[PDB]
Design a protein around this nucleic acid. Sequence first.
DNA 1: GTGAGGAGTCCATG
DNA 2: TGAGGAGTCCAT
Lengths: 216, 1136, 54
Amino acid sequence: DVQAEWSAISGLRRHASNPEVKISLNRQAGYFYRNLIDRLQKKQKGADRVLLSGSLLASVETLLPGEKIRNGSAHVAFLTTSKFLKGFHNTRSRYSPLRDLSGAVLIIDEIDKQNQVILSELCKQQAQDLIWAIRTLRANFRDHQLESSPRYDKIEDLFEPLRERLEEFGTNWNLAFAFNTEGANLNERPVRLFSDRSFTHVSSATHKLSLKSDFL
Amino acid sequence: MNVSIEEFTHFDFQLVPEPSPLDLVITEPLKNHIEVNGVKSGALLPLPFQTGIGKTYTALNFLLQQMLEQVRSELKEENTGKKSKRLLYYVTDSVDNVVSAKADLLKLIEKQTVKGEPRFTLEQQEYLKAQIVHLPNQSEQLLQCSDAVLNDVLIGFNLNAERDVQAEWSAISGLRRHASNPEVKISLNRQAGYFYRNLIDRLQKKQKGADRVLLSGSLLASVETLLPGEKIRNGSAHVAFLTTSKFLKGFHNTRSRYSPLRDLSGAVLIIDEIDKQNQVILSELCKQQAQDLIWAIRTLRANFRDHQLESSPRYDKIEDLFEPLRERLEEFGTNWNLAFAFNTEGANLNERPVRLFSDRSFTHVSSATHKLSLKSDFLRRKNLIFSDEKVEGSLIEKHGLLTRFVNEADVIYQWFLGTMRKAVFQYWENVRGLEIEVRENRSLEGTFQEAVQSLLTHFNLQEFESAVYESFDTRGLRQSAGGKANKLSSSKSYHHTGLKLVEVAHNQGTRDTVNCKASFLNTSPSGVLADMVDAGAVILGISATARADTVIHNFDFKYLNERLGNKLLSLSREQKQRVNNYYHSRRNYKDNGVVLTVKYLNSRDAFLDALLEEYKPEARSSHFILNHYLGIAESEQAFVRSWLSKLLASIKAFISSPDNRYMLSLLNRTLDTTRQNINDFIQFCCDKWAKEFNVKTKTFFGVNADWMRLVGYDEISKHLNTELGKVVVFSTYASMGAGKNPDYAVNLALEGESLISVADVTYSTQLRSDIDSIYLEKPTQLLLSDDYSHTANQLCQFHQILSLQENGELSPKSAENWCRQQLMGMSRERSLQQYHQTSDYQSAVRKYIEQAVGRAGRTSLKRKQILLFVDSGLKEILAEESRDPSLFSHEYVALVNKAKSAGKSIVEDRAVRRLFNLAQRNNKDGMLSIKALVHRLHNQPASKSDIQEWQDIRTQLLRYPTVAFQPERFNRLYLQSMTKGYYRYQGNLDGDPNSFEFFDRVPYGDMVSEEDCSLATLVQNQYVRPWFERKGFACSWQKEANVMTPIMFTNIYKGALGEQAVEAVLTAFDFTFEEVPNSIYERFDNRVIFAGIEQPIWLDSKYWKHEGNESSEGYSSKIALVEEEFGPSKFIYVNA
Amino acid sequence: LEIEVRENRSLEGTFQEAVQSLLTHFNLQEFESAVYESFDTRGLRQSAGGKANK
DNA sequence: GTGAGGAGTCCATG
DNA sequence: TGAGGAGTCCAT
């Protein structure tokens, strides 16, 4: 598979003159890297650690310029704000600059405009179904237990209040059932809610909505 | 213009062309089948045909007649009832066959005439040509459509506003225009496939209610062009042409993906080359995802504890289908402490993984030096895997075993899937009838998807959607109340049981936990075909070698003939005679002067070394010439020398012929540029031999698929009818199976005045010819293998081994040895060595030879002398054939007759060996099943299934000692015997089951018959005789060739007879009997109460003065357990 | 407290192993993607400063 | 009618 | 140490 994809990309590379090859070339060069780097990282994880020396080290460094930081060859970098908030790959895994900033120097030009970039990056978070997550957590946090070893010391004590809270929540809100809408005027338009977690609350309905539990 | 059905109002629907004898063989068995069984049934009918006579003509005429009958049924319809249109399929294994078949059908529709007058008009032809569709893969469908169609489709659904779709479409459109260089094609194909997937997904998700865009006008035509499958759903067309893989996968319409294997009621299926269909089905079944058993079990146990379903009329009679699964999950969770993770312990376990294999019935192997256990520690919160002790463990196993864990996990998983399928069926049944609401499609597709989602959402879960959607296509036709059940009270076979594979190793990243992957295989292609016929479907299969005796290269007709029953239609003798006469008339080789010459060739070293010393004079010895000029090393010289000598002998014998100008060689290897030295050797040898006797010779090198799709096979035909000389071509067995038709037309000027017609009354606009010299090499590598991944190969090998064991060609000892050696690791040569000792190998070789010689003559203009050259290893085999020689072509009979006229030795019949092996297998299965059932019974009873099975087996064995016909329900309790009524045997009933012997080989062994049980002296008592007639028992053993197995004659029958006799004699007097409770089951016989003395009493019985040699400690323990159960008691031991 | 095997490294090195171990032990493996996006030493995607709405 | 009144870009994933 | 090779779908 790797040879097939590499051969296709290499053949497509040799005719990158007219301006319709470029778009496809970029869009598949964006997918070759993921598979190649994933295989390279998985191979080096726990077994068959192939040593790096000679021209092989130079080739890997040329393919992965972020590798030179881990060994210590270079300690100065140039990159943009979008790449800064994501991280770069090395032979082991991805390295996030924001998780370690002790003793560093940052130079930013046009610092004011970075607010918009950070706002754009913060607004791509994926959504989540609350009912499914709460029910899954309530189900799996009932009997399962952790190990008793020196490497797992003073970790269980951090999960007790969560267990005490989840069972009370489930008993009070009847999470053994599911949810559905009843009555007219609620089947043609959805319901939307908004809150700022402190004191601002708005609703998208004329009247207030209530929840009920039916035992039949 | 849009034509309609009204144009057929004035048409003679009774006038039909004159039938042919080949066309009368199909219609009469179907007419008889309709009278016998009914209108709603299935049938499998293999038709042995040949190249030459019009197979395609017959099939296409059948299709056309079906279409016309549908038109007739529609004309007198819409006034008395209404129903959907019947579906007709044409399935093969290659695209070129589909294209050619469609073109031939269209040409036949256009150009058919009757009584000198055309059968159809223009409007009728145009209506008939609009009922057929062709469904290629998703990559070619996108490239077939034009820009306007996609533009209108995008605009109509309002999808041009998006950015990703527009960019991808722009990229594809830009790349398509310059699709001339052979470098941009592959990326174009891949991108087209991905874009088609995304576009179809968006279109399907848009039309899920809400803003359902109405289809009419140009938009409808464009959508139908883009999606040919919508025509079937709306009702435009009802005839489809497609390959096998697309049939197994499915196709798309504007609502969902339609699987053709879910609704076969009705339908007609025409299949060509059914053996390759078997192989393709097997290759498809081996690609499937694995599963982590621990994760699935802990998820099901967690999410089946509190969550509940809704109590509405829609969801009625569904919740009661899940209680046993919940109870079993609770018991499984509490038994093995599923609140902790799993980990290994000790050395020698992290070095290599642990692998386990099982056939689910009686075969188990393990790649572990010692048995591995499972222990639970309450101070570390873990479950540990340890090897105990090397010397037999130094104790008794009381901690548990891994194999039991794996088996119960698999059982629970399969149970869950089956319960889901049943629940969804009940949901559709409930929804369709009542609850008047918006009804659009009252069928099994939309209800299928809605039921699956609704049932999965209520029970949380939602992670098993893929495991349920991809498991319906195979497992939804099971549960036929006897068709698939693993019990001693039901039919058992490998073809609906399967196998299993498990691997245990570390996780990713973590160094404290382990997982258990599992790869399954739930059925075989024979089961798939049987389920296709069982659901109701008419299947027609055309092949010259349909009923062969290979289970590896064909289906298993012994299983199909035992499952289907009367639904497997077969021809009669007179129909075969008519077919033979029709073939003879058009291939009347005799009465004209056509001869066939057959020779067998051996090797000769003097020939070869004289050749090399004549063409390499500067060298000293032949060996040095080989290593230097030709390249063969010293390790593998003899093989090359022998093969080259055998080839050169045939070539030299062919060249020295006056009136022959064509010859092809069928080898096992390709003589490409990698063997240029051998190519040059053969080239100048042929050049010298052509200079000896004055004639011109041309040699063709490298006939491959890559050469037949880049240069063309018409070059050879063109060179023959324009120039003079001889041509010799080199090909392989597999390459000649594609493309076909090696014909050159005519040139009378260059002909050698020798060409004779063979037919009786024939006139043709054009004339052709065929080959007149063939050399055949012995086939090699006759064992299946898979290149997709690594697990598929193992699955295929285990499937082949288990199929061979079930058929009867292998004993259980060899099967277990082969399975163990394969699990540990084997080479290909050692795999072929063990296959070369069976009877299927010769059948496969013979079938390959027959097929190779069958595809050489397709015309009726032949030459007077035909040369056939064969090897000697083939001569060893071809002399052994005993069948009906009616439809055996003309070259095949010559080969067999020439090989037979040499004497040779005799061959042991297959039936004797098969009987011995089947008896051994039945004994082994019975032993293991009985032991497992007894062990389960002595634990907590759980009642229901186990007690009922025990009593049913006892009653059945009491009623029928011997049966006349082959049983269908309990087939693992009887064996076939050479002598009727009794048989001989020897062996140990408490040791290795692979050490038994039967029949002739043991003339001094023990005996199973009517006299040994002494039933004659047991019926003479006055208080026992009427009991037998009251209960319907058998007072004598009827003489039939099916008797109880040795295991079922000692451990079951005697106890039942003794218990019945003691019950009769005691009930004759003033006594009472009852049944024992659950906890004391199998530890006593019954309970007796009389005279008001309660003092609970139990008794035991023995048929004879049996000395069980059981220690008094066990009896004392049983008595103590009984006492502490109740208290004071009395016990009685009775001999019968 | 262990130093049984020589690995050295900092919190950035032994970060995937801990998450995988805890998630495997607690039978919550569908939350792996959601636990990496908002993960760091402390915060950077979940509040800041006082870290208390009181 | 009544508010006001448009180009430009970085990167990841089949 | 026995045996000693090409050909072909379809989807993500």
